[PDB]
Amino acid sequence: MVLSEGEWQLVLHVWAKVEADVAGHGQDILIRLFKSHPETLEKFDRFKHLKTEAEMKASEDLKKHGVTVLTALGAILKKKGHHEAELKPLAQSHATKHKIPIKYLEFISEAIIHVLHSRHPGNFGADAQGAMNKALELFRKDIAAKYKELGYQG
Numbered sequence: 116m117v118l119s120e121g122e123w124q125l126v127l128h129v130w131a132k133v134e135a136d137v138a139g140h141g142q143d144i145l146i147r148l149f150k151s152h153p154e155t156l157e158k159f160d161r162f163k164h165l166k167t168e169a170e171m172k173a174s175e176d177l178k179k180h181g182v183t184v185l186t187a188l189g190a191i192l193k194k195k196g197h198h199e200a201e202l203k204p205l206a207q208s209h210a211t212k213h214k215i216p217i218k219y220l221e222f223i224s225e226a227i228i229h230v231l232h233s234r235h236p237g238n239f240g241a242d243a244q245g246a247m248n249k250a251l252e253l254f255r256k257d258i259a260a261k262y263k264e265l266g267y268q269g
């Protein structure tokens with residue numbers, strides 16, 4: 116997959132909006148993931164005691180982890196597909212330490228798109244959604260290729 120220069124422009128335009136409130140976006144994306152797919156919460160030893168949305172929103176540590184996640188994803192997207200070097204440490208930890216299937220990356224991709232609609236209702240149209248879906252699919256396909264490079268079936 117290759118994005119047009121126009122599609123990358125759209126992705127980076129949207130990402131400038133996430134960067135204005137990284138902690139808010141990151142907290143919402145993780146809660147959305149955990150509510151929609153509660154099996155993913157069991158992968159987080161630090162958070163799996165949290166049982167309800169209201170407990171999750173009160174967790175300062177969940178919020179900090181949201182910042183960690185979006186900061187790495189942002190550095191990757193700014194490379195406009197030339198991201199091999201940035202992917203390698205991410206693929207390494209998620210395949211070999213956390214043991215996260217690619218399917219769970221599809222679930223967090225759906226949570227990102229849901230939260231971008233919920234936080235930017237007039238600012239995230241069909242064209243920007245299409246470009247972001249393509250950039251996140253590019254990311255998932257390339258990280259699935261790095262899993263295989265490391266010897267894992269994602």
Ligand code: HEM
Pocket residue numbers: 155156158159160161183184185187188204205208209213215219220223
């Ligand atoms: C956009 C996709 C994602 C990005 C950019 C990302 C990024 C990160 C980063 C930067 C860290 C800390 C350093 C590291 O361990 O590598 C981390 C930790 C972790 N990730 Fe992800 N991650 C993503 C998706 C996922 C998903 C979907 C799951 C599970 C359902 C997951 C499970 C974990 C766990 C369990 C940790 C360790 C948490 C802890 O510190 O207690 N990751 N991730």
